[PDB]
Enzyme design. Sequence first.
Site, short mmCIF file in Angstrom:
data_model
loop_
_atom_site.label_atom_id
_atom_site.label_comp_id
_atom_site.label_asym_id
_atom_site.label_seq_id
_atom_site.Cartn_x
_atom_site.Cartn_y
_atom_site.Cartn_z
N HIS A 156 -18.70 62.99 -13.44
CA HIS A 156 -17.81 62.10 -12.70
C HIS A 156 -17.38 60.95 -13.60
CE1 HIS A 156 -19.57 63.51 -8.60
NE2 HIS A 156 -18.70 64.35 -9.13
N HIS A 163 -30.90 56.84 -9.81
CA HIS A 163 -30.23 57.94 -9.15
C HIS A 163 -29.49 58.85 -10.13
CE1 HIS A 163 -31.07 55.73 -5.47
NE2 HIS A 163 -30.45 54.68 -5.97
N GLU A 200 -21.89 68.93 -7.09
CA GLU A 200 -21.62 68.36 -5.77
C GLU A 200 -20.47 69.11 -5.11
OE1 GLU A 200 -21.60 63.92 -6.29
OE2 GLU A 200 -23.60 64.26 -5.41
N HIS A 219 -24.32 64.64 -12.07
CA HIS A 219 -25.25 65.15 -11.07
C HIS A 219 -25.69 66.52 -11.54
CE1 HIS A 219 -23.79 62.07 -8.15
NE2 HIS A 219 -22.69 62.23 -8.87
N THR A 238 -19.99 59.72 -3.37
CA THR A 238 -20.96 60.73 -2.95
C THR A 238 -22.37 60.18 -2.85
OG1 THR A 238 -21.47 61.55 -5.16
CG2 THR A 238 -19.54 62.57 -3.99
N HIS A 255 -20.97 59.41 -15.14
CA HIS A 255 -22.32 59.87 -14.88
C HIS A 255 -22.25 61.34 -14.50
CE1 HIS A 255 -20.73 58.74 -10.96
NE2 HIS A 255 -21.43 59.79 -10.53
N1 LIG Z 1 -20.82 59.98 -7.32
S1 LIG Z 1 -19.39 59.08 -7.26
O1 LIG Z 1 -18.65 59.34 -6.02
O2 LIG Z 1 -18.53 59.30 -8.42
C1 LIG Z 1 -19.80 57.30 -7.31
C2 LIG Z 1 -19.12 56.53 -8.23
C3 LIG Z 1 -19.36 55.18 -8.35
C4 LIG Z 1 -20.30 54.57 -7.54
N2 LIG Z 1 -20.63 53.15 -7.65
C5 LIG Z 1 -20.38 52.38 -8.87
O3 LIG Z 1 -19.85 52.85 -9.83
C6 LIG Z 1 -20.81 50.92 -8.95
N3 LIG Z 1 -20.80 50.58 -10.36
C7 LIG Z 1 -19.83 49.80 -10.83
C8 LIG Z 1 -19.80 49.49 -12.17
C9 LIG Z 1 -20.77 50.01 -12.98
O4 LIG Z 1 -20.78 49.77 -14.14
N4 LIG Z 1 -21.69 50.78 -12.46
C10 LIG Z 1 -21.73 51.08 -11.18
O5 LIG Z 1 -22.59 51.78 -10.76
C11 LIG Z 1 -21.00 55.34 -6.62
C12 LIG Z 1 -20.74 56.70 -6.49
ZN LIG Z 2 -21.06 61.00 -8.95
#
Ligand SMILES: NS(=O)(=O)c1ccc(NC(=O)Cn2ccc(=O)[nH]c2=O)cc1
Ligand SMILES: [Zn+2]
EC number: 4.2.1.1
Length: 258
Positions: A117, A62, A104, A94, A196, A92
């Site tokens: 983010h 994703h 977003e 988007h 999100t 990460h």
């Molecule tokens: N787009 S967001 O709202 O910022 C958003 C931010 C975070 C998540 N979920 C996680 O982080 C779970 N997780 C936890 C530890 C890790 O190392 N990696 C990982 O994926 C989903 C959406």
């Molecule tokens: Zn995000």
Amino acid sequence: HHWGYGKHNGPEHWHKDFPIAKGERQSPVDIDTHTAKYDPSLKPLSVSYDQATSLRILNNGHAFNVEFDDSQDKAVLKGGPLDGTYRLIQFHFHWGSLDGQGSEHTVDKKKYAAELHLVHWNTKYGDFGKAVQQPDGLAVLGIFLKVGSAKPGLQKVVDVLDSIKTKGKSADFTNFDPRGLLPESLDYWTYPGSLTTPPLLECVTWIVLKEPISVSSEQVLKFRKLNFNGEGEPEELMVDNWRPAQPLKNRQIKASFK
Ligand SMILES: NS(=O)(=O)c1ccc(NC(=O)Cn2ccc(=O)[nH]c2=O)cc1
Ligand SMILES: [Zn+2]
């Protein structure tokens, strides 16, 4: 038939598996700059990233996550609207298929080319998995990207993406300094919201910086060469991995600045 960003599994479908998609504090939102209210009681943000320990970069199908060691208070966010200490776990982005879309959050309906983010969890809940079950469990620092001059501190990320082209690939990614991704000003908007992506949990204090960073066309073009698919599956470019703005409902966006 799992969730994603295609015609048949994209954001308008997510509510069928994740009914909270139609909830009362969903993200992202449009930031109407004239309606956001300056809140003089908000404190300056404290971004303490000098001891950050990055470990790995992962294509999760994703986006790509740069993951950090969060077993100690090494890279933390405090202040602003936050009570307590929030530890950086991953960042990460988007982004779009074209420079005219990808973010977003929007600002007076303006879409940026991408959005960073930086995801942090509230240390009072002990780990990330417990934190996402709490209304004040996460703080996500959002930073807009516009296309113009290169961001030198992003280049180390860009250059490793060839090694994680497809879903499930990871690579060592140590000694990366996320301070090189910040704009000059820490002026921000803040509101209560959600993840999100599924599971769309309503656990996030959003802190969205007003000042975008500039990245080059070549930098964002390299984001667009990633794949949503796994190796040996039909190639689908990882582009337009953004959720559109959701209804604000009974929420007020606050500004840290006049
Ligand atoms: N787009 S967001 O709202 O910022 C958003 C931010 C975070 C998540 N979920 C996680 O982080 C779970 N997780 C936890 C530890 C890790 O190392 N990696 C990982 O994926 C989903 C959406
Ligand atoms: Zn995000």
